[PDB]
């Protein structure tokens, strides 16, 4: 690569005071991924095909028609990431199992050539002294359980989805010790069903039909059924002889009130209720919030008795995963008629107060880089639930796709951003908070949903022409804070 490649920036050197030192003994930091953003092999090596390669096919559905059936092939290459991640001082590595990869079809026949790659990547690891985390789900819902019943939206989803995840305990088990059921289980609801951003694109105005006002509900209902009976398995088959752990990963945005008044507050709350909340209330309580329960009145569904308590306490930790805030205010009054479970929100955004932006943003359209956000979002998370152990499960933020290696690899601006959350982090756990470890997204450049290849969430760069990897500077910056 060209001399400037190789430039040594010296932010690389100001870890802002942070060490290991400066966090719980034992505190755990690594990289987060998932099976569809990194693996390739989409359609080889056994896979079935899941909601999202069907989603792909849809003429100008990722940017430039691009695909992941190769992405970072971190399927073939998977050693070579691995040892970055030794390299760079990371103790452990969140990765995602590919449903359709182990069941091609959701249930009944096993894939032993998936789950033979698997047991490959996590062998490894363990033989490097990397942590295995496995997340069970991360946008992937093989097509052919959408094809029989429409995937979330049938209570037949449950048990074929804890019957997988049971496989996956009795397989996996001997040496993973950390499982989440779901990375963002509002995001399958949200993205998949009220907006059809993401696979399988259901929305009330959408191509594949759909609806806005019913749908999202009963998704993150069966989600929540599905993560509870998955945890039911880990419990009483697998926990006391493996002796690991199970949470769940749900993103927070969090919501700061525009202004001191009771209808600001009283908004910033309400978008609390329905992003977190909705999951979290039931996982902690057993119930709905109550917010959600009064505006979405017979469009939500309710808990017998029996899943109530199948649902609460149904994990052993929470992983959050947190980027960004908002200013919230009260929008006024409220229609009144059903049109989606983001306008069930009533609520208004804002990005600026007196002029000044919130922060600056990043790649992403939703991206705003706001630091003291990680340390409001998880001090909230403390007050409201208890004190519950939590991990902060993802954090990081992007590069627009199209720059060069030379470019890339100088991002201070990640470097800023990490150092800047991390300390944020740490303040909020010296005040009490639970925290027993961070991970950043992501190793890798990689494939990022309908962004395609856009945008750059990497702290290693990927030359996607050669797949070759170069550490971006924020690389060596964790490398240095970590020793
Ligand atoms: O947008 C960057 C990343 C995605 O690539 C991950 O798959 C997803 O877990 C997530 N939630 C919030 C931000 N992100």
């Known amino acids: 690569a060209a001399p400037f490649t190789y430039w040594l920036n010296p932010e690389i050197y100001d870890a802002g005071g942070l060490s290991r030192r400066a966090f719980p003994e034992g505190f755990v930091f690594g990289t987060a991924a ?6 390739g092999m989409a359609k080889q090596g056994g896979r079935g095909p899941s909601i999202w390669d069907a989603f792909i096919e849809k003429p100008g559905t990722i940017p430039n028609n691009a695909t992941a059936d190769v992405t970072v092939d971190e399927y073939h290459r998977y050693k070579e990431d691995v040892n970055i991640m030794k390299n760079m001082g990371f103790d452990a590595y969140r990765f995602s199992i590919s449903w359709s990869r182990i069941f091609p ?55 074929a989805f804890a019957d997988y995840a049971d496989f996956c305990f009795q397989t996996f088990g001997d040496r993973v010790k950390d499982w989440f059921t779901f990375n963002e289980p509002r995001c399958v609801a949200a993205l998949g069903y009220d907006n059809g951003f993401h696979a399988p694109g259901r929305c009330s105005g959408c191509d594949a039909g759909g609806n806005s006002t019913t749908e999202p509900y009963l998704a993150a209902h069966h989600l929540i059924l599905s993560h509870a009976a998955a945890v039911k398995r880990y419990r009483e088959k697998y926990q006391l002889y493996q002796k690991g752990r199970i949470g769940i990963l749900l993103d927070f945005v969090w919501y700061e009130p525009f202004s001191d008044s009771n209808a600001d507050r009283a908004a910033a709350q309400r978008a609390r209720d329905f992003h977190l909340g909705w999951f ?19 469009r939500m569904p309710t808990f017998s008795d029996e899943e109530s308590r199948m649902v609460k306490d149904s994990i052993d930790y929470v992983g959050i995963n947190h980027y960004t805030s908002f200013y919230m205010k009260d929008p006024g009054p409220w229609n009144l008629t059903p049109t989606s479970y983001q306008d ?21 359209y939703w991206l705003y880089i706001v630091p003291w956000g990680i340390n409001k979002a998880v001090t909230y998370v403390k007050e409201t639930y208890g004190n519950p152990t939590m991990i902060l499960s993802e954090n990081g933020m992007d590069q627009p796709g199209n720059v060069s290696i030379t470019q890339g690899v100088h991002d201070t601006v990640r470097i800023r951003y990490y150092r800047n959350y991390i300390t944020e982090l740490k303040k909020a756990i010296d005040d009490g908070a639970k925290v027993i470890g961070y991970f950043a997204w992501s190793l890798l450049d990689n494939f990022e949903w309908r962004l395609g290849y856009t945008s750059r969430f990497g702290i290693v760069y990927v030359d996607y022409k050669t797949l070759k990897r170069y550490p971006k500077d924020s690389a060596f910056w964790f490398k240095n804070m970590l020793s």
């Open 34 to 39: 998932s099976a569809y953003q990194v693996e």
């Open 344 to 364: 069930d929100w009533h609520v208004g955004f804002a990005y600026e107060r007196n002029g000044v932006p919130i922060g600056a943003q990043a790649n992403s």
């Open 280 to 298: 979290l209330d039931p996982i902690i309580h057993g119930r709905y919030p109550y917010s959600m329960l009064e505006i979405v009145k017979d």
């Open 105 to 159: 079809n959701g249930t009944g026949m096993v894939n032993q050539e998936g789950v033979d790659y698997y047991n490959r990547l996590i062998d490894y690891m363990v033989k490097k002294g990397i942590k295995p985390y496995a997340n069970l789900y991360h946008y992937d819902l093989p097509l052919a359980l959408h094809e029989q019943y429409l995937g979330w939206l049938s209570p037949n989803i449950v048990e």
